Structure formats: C-alpha cells, structure tokens
Amino acid sequence: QEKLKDKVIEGLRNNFLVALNAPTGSGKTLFSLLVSLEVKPKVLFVVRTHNEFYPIYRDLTKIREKRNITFSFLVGKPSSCLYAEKGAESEDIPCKYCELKGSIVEVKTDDSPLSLVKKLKKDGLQDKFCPYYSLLNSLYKADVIALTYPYFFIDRYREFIDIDLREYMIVIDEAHNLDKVNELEERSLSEITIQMAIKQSKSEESRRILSKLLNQLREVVLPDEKYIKVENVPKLSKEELEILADDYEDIRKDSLKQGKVNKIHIGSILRFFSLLFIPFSYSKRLVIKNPEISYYLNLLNDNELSIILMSGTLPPREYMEKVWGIKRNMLYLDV
Ligand code: SF4
C-alpha cells in the first residue's frame, strides 16, 4: 500500500503482536528489514524448513548492494557434521569426544545456503574445523538470522542454541503453517526399535534389559489401528536406565572412531522414558499423544518478544485466540 509501517512500528512499540494478512510474493523481506531498524538491532525469520533459507538469501543479496547486512542460518548437526549419515539424530552426534568441537572458522555468507554448507564440509575435513560450530558462531554475530520451526518451538531443539530472543524482531512468514507445529514430535516406542537397539548394543546387561522391555511392551500394546489407553506401562528403574545410558555413550564413542554416525536406536528409547502423562496403544506401538497446538505457541504471548506474523491466508482472529491460545493484544491488519 504505502506506510502501514508506522502502524507496524507503533504496534510493536506498544507490545502488540502484529498479524499481517498480506497478498503473497511482494518484497516482504525488504519490508521486515526496514521496520526492524526502528524497533530491534537484529531480525530473526522463523521458517518451516531449511528449504525456506534459499528465498531469504536471494531477497537480501539484492538488499546487500544498497545496505551492508550479514545473513546467517542454522542447520542441525546431522546436516553439518563431517561424519553424519542420513538417519543420525542430533544427540547421536558425538561432539563430546571429537577433536573439532572447539575448532571454529570465520564464515563468508556470499554463498547460497546449500553452497555454503557443502564448502564448509569439504574445507572442514581438509583444514580440520567443525562446520556446525562454525555456523553456530556465525549465527550469534549476524544482523539477520533464520531458524526452522523445531529450533524455535520445540524444547528438544531449542536447548541446542543459546540465543536471547529479546534482541530480535521475530518474523514468522507463511504463518498459517503454525497450525502444524504440534505434528513435529513423535513420542513412541515400537517393537522394531527395541530389537534394533538389541542388535546395535555393546553390553550383555543392556541386551537383557532391552529384552525384558520388549516383553513388557508386548503385554500392554494391542494390534488395533486405534488409540487405546494403557494401564501399567513398562518400567525401567534408575539403575536399569543407567545401564541403557552408558550403552548409548559407548555406541557414540565407537561411531566417531569410524568415519560414520548412524541412527542410535537406544537414544530414541531413553528419550521416550524421559517423559515418564497418559500413554496409549496405536498399531502395536506405545504412544504419548502430542500436546495441543496452544502449548507450543504459548511463547508468542510473552510481551518481552516483538513478533510479526504474516500470511496470505492468515486464520481468523477468533481461531488464533481460541485454538492457538494467543491471549496477548494483537494488531490485526488486513491489507
Ligand atoms: S564434526 Fe565433530 S564437532 Fe563437529 S559436529 Fe561432528 S562431531 Fe561434532
């Protein structure tokens, strides 16, 4: 339009969450960066997946000719570690034992995101530095950053980074996608996972405990493709959990000795038992259903955070209040 912008700046300066219904594909990155100047020193774009880094990179290279700004993004350890294979979870990455953990290089973000990451992996192996910690370090300095939904909304991933969100104007584009944040975790335990953990194991005691757990699971689960409540779920004592936990560490040590980090199945199991809640049977698997969508989005109610939501098909005010649980004052602008 013009300068619905002083509206946005005033909105943010009054601690209103700004919800912007905007016709799509219209220089949105430039708009957000301009309105940040007046509000916050840095900008954070929260995006669905790492595939949304590229369009942001494309848009602000145009901006970089008129204004000097640094862009950085975070990809997980599984996408940046020198030794990671497909299937490797972030906690499986054995940085505790790796010589490169404290080996950082200065990153130059004139490359696109996939180009940058591939270059850091190639150079990292030759010149002995860690791509991940190099990206992480570059992230903490940058004027504009971008993170994926898991790193912003999900505790498991949020604990991997050390970032004060109060320094950022937080922009969540395609914000209708926030509706799916409650589908990003799966908190389940299957027969096959346990058996794969038995195969992968490096101690008899761990195999014995995993085997007893496999049996316990079989008594409670039911074959029905239907959620059914379970009384008396399997139990692991503190001392049994100790033995399963040092088995995890032994597999992590061994993997780093090889060039090669794979999925460690016992990690999944131990994380399932951190949550114990009402547990269910679904299709021979034990499941803890995910929280409601408002549990994940509750963070948006903290008045300490300056937040803009934008979308072409933003949900009605009523739905954002009742279903997403946004109870903080909201400046809803239909452009
Ligand atoms: S290279 Fe080493 S330090 Fe870097 S992520 Fe992989 S394990 Fe960790």
Numbering used by the authors: 8 to 283, 288 to 346
From the study:
XPD (xeroderma pigmentosum group D) is a 5′-3′ superfamily 2 (SF2) helicase that unwinds damaged DNA during the process of nucleotide excision repair (NER). The major enzymatic function of XPD is to unwind the DNA double helix around lesions such as photoproducts to allow repair. In eukaryotes, XPD is one of the components of transcription factor IIH (TFIIH) along with nine other protein subunits. The mechanism of XPD helicase activity remains unclear with uncertainties about the binding of the 3′-end of the translocated DNA strand, the positioning of the junction between single- and double-stranded DNA and the role of protein conformational change in unwinding the DNA.
The crystal structure of SaXPD, obtained from crystals that grew after an unexpectedly long (3 months) time, revealed the absence of the HD2 domain, which most probably was proteolytically cleaved. Interestingly, the rest of the domains maintained the closed conformation, with the Arch domain being only slightly shifted compared to the full-length protein, probably due to lost interactions between the Arch domain and HD2 domain. The crystal packing positioned the Arch domain from a symmetric molecule in place of the missing HD2 domain. Remarkably the structure of SaXPD with HD2 missing adopts the same closed state as the full-length protein, consistent with its stability, recently highlighted by spin labelling and mutational analysis of residues at this interface in TaXPD. In contrast, the integrity of the FeS cluster/domain is greatly affected when not stabilized by the contact with the Arch domain. Overall, the data indicate a highly stable closed conformation of the pore. However, in the case of Sulfolobus acidocaldarius XPD (SaXPD) the ‘pore’ does not actually exist when the molecule is viewed as a surface, rather a pore appears only in cartoon representations.
